[PDB]
From a paper:
Here, we report a general and rapid method for discovering α-helically constrained (Helicon) polypeptides that cooperatively induce the interaction between two target proteins without relying on previously known binders or an intrinsic affinity between the proteins. We show that Helicons are capable of binding every major class of E3 ubiquitin ligases, which are of great biological and therapeutic interest but remain largely intractable to targeting by small molecules. In addition to possessing increased stability and membrane permeability, Helicons are capable of binding large, flat protein surfaces that are inaccessible to targeting by small molecules, and Helicons have been developed to target a range of PPI targets in cells and in vivo. Characterizing Helicon-E3 co-structures and mechanisms of action, we identified new binding sites for α-helices on the E3 surfaces, as well as potential probes of the disease-linked E3, WWP123,24, highlighting the generality of our approach against this therapeutically important target class.
We screened MDM2-based focused libraries against β-catenin, a key component of the canonical Wnt signaling pathway that is often dysregulated in cancer. This screen identified hits belonging to multiple clusters, including C91-C93, that bound β-catenin only in the presence of MDM2. First, we used a direct FP assay of ternary complex formation to show that H329 and H330 from C91, H332 and H333 from C92, H334 from C93, and an N-terminally truncated version of H329 (H331) could all promote a cooperative interaction between MDM2 and the Armadillo domain of β-catenin with EC50 values ranging from 10 to 100 nM. Notably, none of the Helicons that we tested could promote ternary complex formation between β-catenin and MDM4, which shares ~55% sequence identity with MDM2 in the p53-binding domain used in these studies, demonstrating the ability of these trimerizer Helicons to bind with selectivity against a related family member. Finally, we performed x-ray crystallography to characterize the MDM2-β-catenin complexes induced by trimerizers H329 and H330 from C91 and H332 and H333 from C92. Of note, the structures of MDM2-H332-β-catenin and MDM2-H333-β-catenin were solved in different space groups and with distinct crystal packings, but resolved a similar MDM2-β-catenin interaction, excluding potential artifacts arising from crystallography. Gratifyingly, all four structures confirmed Helicon-mediated ternary complex formation, with the Helicons bridging the p53-binding site of MDM2 and the C-terminal ICAT-binding site of β-catenin. The Helicons from the two clusters engage different subsites and residues on the surface of the proteins, revealing distinct structural solutions to cooperative ternary complex formation.
Author numbering:
A (entry chain B): 26 to 110
B (entry chain A): 149 to 552, 560 to 665
C (entry chain C): 8 to 20
């Protein structure tokens, strides 16, 4: 499966340092998990919560704080800022 | 009257091989009349010399007159026993080697009549050199001659696996294919196909016919008018498609079986979807060609107009399962079932009076139909969740009779498929309320103890698809799941080290 | 616990 993200999302991948313009869902779920962990967005008390009040994720996704394993929501929140190919 | 046979007897045994030619020149001549024909048959001393002159001559007119005389006796009854009691069978088959056309039409016919209108010959020919010489003479330029030759192969290989093996080692299948692929005579093609069927059922010749190119050649005559030839080709491929998964050339063969699904012969469709059910189990590009010839619309229509007849729906559902799973055209094949109105009928096959072997294939089709999210809602509307749970309930409340097949279904497979289908359906949030509302969670936990590594893969997987909602999460963490899942994180397959841990990640965390 | 999280996240893809 190959997808081409929308440029308002590419900034996130280009921040950790993406080079391609299209990625597999493995790579998008990899570069994104690197951002949250680099920029430190988890709650280190209990780490299954991700915060993004005034962050790029808070603009891309739309929810100020989402859990790690809500699955389908995360799968679909990504699935609006890409055009599949 | 007799009174002339000993006069006619010794002259053929004359050591002068020129008078013998001048002796048998009139015996074939005198055997034409029905009158004098009875005189030769009544004398085994006369026939016992014609047999010897056949297997022991260097001339041509002698062999034609001798074997020609034996043909004139085959039409009459007691003229066959004399050929059989004078030991003619080992001699006639011998003349199936000496190269001459004028004797073969007299020899292969005299053997053909002996194979039918007299018993015992079907065994003596197998012993005395038959099937060898017959298969070896399949390359003759004549066609009607081969209609008799191939028919003798059907009589001898009929139900006798000794003979069936014999034709195999002679390079049999490779030669029989070149007869269907080439000639155009209906009677020969009907016989050659009638031979390949009684060669298909024996699981030794099955790959050899495919290896030579039997499938691709037998599909050429699927459009011929005579239905006695058409259904014999389909009957062959149905038994012969078990070992044809790994070769090409069937491009036109698949663009013909689809049109046969819209036929008024019920026995033709049954022998047509069972072929596609087998010719799509592992091949990648085969599924493409079916989708590319409109295989979905023509196959979905078949399940509708076939009714509760499971014998038609069983291969048809398997065929749809293959076209919708693991290949390039998956997103479309999962969609064309909905656009051609195939979703409601598939859910109806879940309910009775459908037997279990069909249901086993249908509950496995649902997990493929639910991959494309455009089918999550129509399945819920057709009552898929409350029915899949019902089958899942009895399947567990039947294999739980451990306190103690035939139907053909190992009851651990229904649990393996239903909990595998729900794992895919549990993606739409509305399904997660129905599956939760049906009081099913305390049942998946009991399944989590099944020593089957496929039950744990989907049971601990469908619970992962239910772990999103907290309304169900902290409910699962109460009815078990805390301890049995604790040491599912060291099972061998990496499909269970995860999943089973993916459930624990959301439960008793914060 | 976050490193052991996003791996099981991208398991159902
Ligand atoms: C797949 C999965 O969920 N693995 C997992 C997640 C969390 C923990 N939590 C902690 O270690 C605190 C273990 C395994």
């Amino acid at each position: 499966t190959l997808v081409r993200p929308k440029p308002l999302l590419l900034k996130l991948l280009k921040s950790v340092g993406a080079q391609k313009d299209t990625y597999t869902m493995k790579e998008v779920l990899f570069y994104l998990g690197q951002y949250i962990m680099t920029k430190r967005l988890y709650d280190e008390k209990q780490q299954h919560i991700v915060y993004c009040s005034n962050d790029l994720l808070g603009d891309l996704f739309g929810v100020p704080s989402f859990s790690v394993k809500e699955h389908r929501k995360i799968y679909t929140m990504i699935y609006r800022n890409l055009v599949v190919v | 009257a007799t009174r002339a046979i000993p006069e006619l007897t010794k002259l053929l045994n004359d050591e002068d091989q020129v008078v013998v030619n001048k002796a048998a020149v009139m015996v074939h001549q005198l055997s034409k009349k029905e009158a004098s024909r009875h005189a030769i048959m009544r004398s085994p001393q006369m026939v016992s010399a014609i047999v010897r002159t056949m297997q022991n001559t260097n001339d041509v007119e002698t062999a034609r007159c001798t074997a020609g005389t034996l043909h004139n006796l085959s039409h009459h009854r007691e003229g066959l026993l004399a050929i059989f009691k004078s030991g003619g069978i080992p001699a006639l088959v011998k003349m199936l080697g000496s190269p001459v056309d004028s004797v073969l039409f007299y020899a292969i016919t005299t053997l053909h009549n002996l194979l039918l209108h007299q018993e015992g010959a079907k065994m003596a020919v197998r012993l005395a050199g038959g099937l060898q010489k017959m298969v070896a003479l399949l390359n003759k330029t004549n066609v009607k001659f081969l209609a008799i030759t191939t028919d003798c192969l059907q009589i001898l290989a009929y139900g006798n696996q000794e003979s069936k093996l014999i034709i195999l080692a002679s390079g049999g299948p490779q030669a029989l294919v070149n007869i269907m692929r080439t000639y155009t005579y209906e009677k020969l093609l009907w016989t050659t196909s009638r031979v390949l069927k009684v060669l298909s059922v024996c699981s030794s010749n099955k790959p050899a016919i495919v290896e030579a190119g039997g499938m691709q050649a037998l599909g050429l005559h699927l459009t011929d008018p005579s239905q006695r030839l058409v259904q014999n080709c389909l009957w062959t491929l149905r038994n012969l498609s078990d070992a044809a998964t790994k070769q090409e050339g069937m491009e036109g063969l698949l663009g013909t079986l689809v049109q046969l699904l819209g036929s008024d012969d019920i026995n033709v469709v049954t022998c047509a979807a069972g072929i596609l059910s087998n010719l799509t189990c592992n091949n990648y590009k085969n599924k493409m060609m079916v989708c590319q010839v409109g295989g979905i619309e023509a196959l979905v229509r078949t399940v509708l107009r076939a009714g509760d007849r499971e014998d038609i729906t069983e291969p048809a559902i398997c065929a749809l399962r293959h076209l919708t799973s693991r290949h390039q055209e998956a997103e479309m094949a999962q969609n064309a079932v909905r656009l051609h109105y195939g979703l409601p009928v598939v859910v109806k096959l879940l309910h009775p009076p459908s037997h279990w072997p069909l249901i086993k294939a249908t509950v496995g089709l649902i997990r493929n139909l639910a991959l494309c999210p455009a089918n999550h809602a129509p399945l819920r509307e057709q009552g898929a969740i409350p029915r899949l749970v019902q089958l899942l309930v009895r399947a567990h409340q039947d294999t739980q009779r451990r306190t103690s097949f035939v139907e053909g279904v190992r009851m651990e497979e229904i649990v393996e498929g239903c909990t595998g289908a729900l794992h895919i359906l549990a993606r739409d949030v509305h399904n997660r309320i129905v599956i939760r509302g049906l009081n099913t969670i305390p049942l998946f936990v009991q399944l989590l103890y099944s020593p089957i590594e496929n039950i744990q893969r989907v049971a601990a997987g469908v619970l992962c698809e239910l772990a999103q909602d907290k309304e169900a999460a902290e409910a699962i963490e109460a009815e078990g799941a805390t301890a049995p899942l604790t040491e599912l994180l060291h099972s061998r397959n990496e499909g269970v080290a995860t999943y089973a841990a993916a459930v624990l990640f959301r439960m008793s965390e914060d | 616990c976050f490193w052991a999280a996003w791996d099981c996240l991208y398991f159902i893809y």
